[PDB]
Amino acid sequence: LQLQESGPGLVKPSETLSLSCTVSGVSISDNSYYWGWIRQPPGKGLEWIGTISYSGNTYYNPSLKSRVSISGDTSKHQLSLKVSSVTAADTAVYYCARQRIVSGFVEWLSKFDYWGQGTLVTVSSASTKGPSVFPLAPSTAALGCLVKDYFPEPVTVSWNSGALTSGVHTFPAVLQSSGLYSLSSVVTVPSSSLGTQTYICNVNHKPSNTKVDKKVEPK
């Protein structure tokens, strides 16, 4: 029962956006199930994009019908969403979801029972940029990483390959005057462990395929 959104985190204006969703544990052409795409602009609400049945048929939202195209690959168990001729207003988080239906005169679109986790796609004429990661030394003890000058979001930050959870607090990125982002992540740790345990952050930036690990040290 899993849905995994996939695709680039950036597209330029007047360019076709392409996203994909890998479905797991259920067949993408199984009867009684429909699959669809939904989008959410930063700080805004949900907008349905379109839905595809268990057969070939697709239905779309008349507000984006001209540009939107959806396809299901029955052998790969995955969806495809195309959005041609993008603009600034297409910047959004795209979601993959499974849609139930009600069988009457027409199979009626219904409740979305399972949702994936979306992909933030930014529309911009700028190109991607990986972050310049710098360590923030500790001083009971607060230490962290500074992920500087990158584009566009998201950035994921793990500590000790996910082993360190307790005390982790990552902050919201700031959009700098330059057009690039800056993001910090810190961990509150026992000061007694500063010289005994290794503390390394794991900065991922999917738009530029960048992964930066950085050991943070005192002094």
Add this chain to the structure above:
Amino acid sequence: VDSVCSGTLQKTEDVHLMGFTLSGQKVADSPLEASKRWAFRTGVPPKNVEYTEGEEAKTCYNISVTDPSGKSLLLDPPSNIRDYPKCKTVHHIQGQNPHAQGIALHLWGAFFLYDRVASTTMYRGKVFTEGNIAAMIVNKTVHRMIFS
């Protein structure tokens, strides 16, 4: 008067066929209710018949229904099928049927009404309302006063 001779028909133009809706017959017309009166079937040839005037419709439907493969289960509209003239609210519906065959036939024996054309079946993508028709004699003078 109850006599066979009561009534005069001077031209054929004075025969008027009026379409009255089922909504005007206090029948539930919500899409989910309305669709319970529609059904698919084979072996029946769709028939159409011309009429002259009709009631302003409360609700209408603009429907497309296919089979899973995307092929319409509804017939393509003939040249003479136009959207119903006056609908207050149109219900646009587009979808597919998992296991249905044939054409859409009204259960009550009522007609699918379009613009001056009544039918035993539902045409793909055309605005219609459900109803029945009635025949009567109206001379031009009577006709002119009503419609004006």
